[PDB]
Amino acid sequence: AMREPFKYVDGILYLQAWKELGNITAGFTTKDGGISTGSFHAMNLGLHVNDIVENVHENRRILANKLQKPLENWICSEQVHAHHVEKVGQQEKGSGVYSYEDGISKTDGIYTSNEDVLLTSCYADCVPLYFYAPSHGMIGLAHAGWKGTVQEIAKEMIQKWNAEGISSDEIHVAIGPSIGSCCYVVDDRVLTAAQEVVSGAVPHQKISDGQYAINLKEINRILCVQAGIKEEHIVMSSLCTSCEEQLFFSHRRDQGKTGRMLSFIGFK
């Protein structure tokens, strides 16, 4: 069984599996630590989910202080459930920190070699992908719901890194908390799209006619291996956003009214 690569520390799940690879701050937030209430209780870091902005701004400031990464150096994207990956850095510092529309336009993955920035991505069920090539000082995040998964957003990131001279055998990938097969049931449209890009069987369990439980974390792991990532360079959480009702917001479990966690990565 793949060991859990994240450790809960004061409300934050830090990517402890990568502590010896390089001096980075990486992890995934939880519902704990903020001042939001109701459907957004407590650490809602999402600006586009109808929470009161003052609470989201404060929650962001709280995280910035916990991570020692000032808001002015954060980079956020306007996620659109597609496969666009953008290299970011100095000129994009501050993008989306206070207004979602100010985020990197229609982008689901971001990467950088800049040591002062904090890359961020928002989640409430979708798969958080993390990338690190320690030898090249390159870090990245990609948002993979079913659409980004089957549109091969992980491969988009890897291909861009290959063009920057980074071999796929030097890229470490982490897969964070997401909706698991215990709670995520999809139709033939999703399963077929996954079959089109996965060589071999897509792991799935039929629940009823045209209804299949699927593990999008494992689908992304398989696609990463098939894109040249070494199996031993992938770490994967088993945490389910829907099942963990005290740790995570879940778009599916909370019926579309919920907050957002952030995935984050930056140099210490």
Closest by CA position to 265, among listed 173, 198, 183, 169:
173
Q: Give the burial string for 57-76 (b: 16+ CB within 10 Å, else e).
A: eebbebbbeebebebebbbb
Kindly tell me which of 9 and 182 has the beta carbon lying closer to Zn ion: 182
Q: Which does 27 bind (CB under 5 to 8 A by kind): Ca ion, Zn ion, none?
A: none
126 lies in the binding site for Zn ion (CB under 5 A) = yes
Q: Which does 126 bind (CB under 5 to 8 A by kind): Ca ion, Zn ion, none?
A: Zn ion
User: x/- string (CB under 5 A) for Ca ion, residues 168-207?
Assistant: ---------------------------x------------
Query: Do the beta carbons of residue 87 and residue 75 sit within 8 Å?
Result: no
Closest by CA position to 215, among listed 127, 147, 143:
127
Provide the strand spans (E) within the chain: 6-9, 12-15, 24-29, 74-75, 85-87, 109-112, 118-123, 127-133, 138-144, 172-175, 185-186, 204-208, 211-214, 234-236, 261-267
- Helix, strand or coil, per DSSP, at residue 45: coil
145 lies in the binding site for Zn ion (CB under 5 A) = yes
Query: Do the beta carbons of residue 251 and residue 125 sit within 8 Å?
Result: yes
Q: Which does 195 bind (CB under 5 to 8 A by kind): Ca ion, Zn ion, none?
A: Ca ion
Kindly tell me which of 113 and 195 has the beta carbon lying closer to Ca ion: 195
Q: Which does 240 bind (CB under 5 to 8 A by kind): Zn ion, Ca ion, none?
A: Zn ion
180 lies in the binding site for Zn ion (CB under 5 A) = yes
Stretch that binds Zn ion, among 47-55, 121-129, 134-142, 253-261 (CB under 5 A): 121-129
Nearest distance, CB of residue 91 and Ca ion, angstroms? 40
Kindly tell me which of 159 and 195 has the beta carbon lying closer to Ca ion: 195
Residues 215-244 that bind Zn ion (CB under 5 A): 240, 242-243
Contacts with Ca ion, residue ranges (CB under 5 A) = 195
